[PDB]
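Board work, copied verbatim: Polyketide cyclase
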Amino acid sequence: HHHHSSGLVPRGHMAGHTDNEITIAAPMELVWNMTNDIEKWPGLFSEYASVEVLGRDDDKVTFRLTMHPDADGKVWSWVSERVADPVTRTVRAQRVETGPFQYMNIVWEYAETAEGTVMRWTQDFAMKPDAPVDDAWMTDNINRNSRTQMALIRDRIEQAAGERRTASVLAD
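↓ predict structure ↓
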């Protein structure tokens, strides 16, 4: 691989845009497969109470997200769509029901490095003019919560990789 990476690193910055990367010490196939197994997100991520696949059109997958209750106790739920391309190791998603946003576009990209798989998440959005918070606020909130979720995904995938390795080394 000959490039190196490590840890959780912000990239780019500007309100309405977030860009963060994390290195996960696991091979690309495992990282790709677990992060894209969206019905198991509630066990991988800590932020979704449930993820339900609604349909697939060719590759476009359409799905409904339901969060845990927010600080006011409210439960937010919406439909998004995503196209995951394993050849370019890129996923492009957007909210279909935009909620308090005018739009929200989320791109995930993956590559290999000497330390494992780097996964970079970029989000672009703008709040509706009458939304309860502004872009600056939402930008800081998404950065902070992304950082927490990326780290938890890193931990759970490194755990899974370790367990599969132990099973294989102990098997005949």
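The chain has three helices and eight strands.
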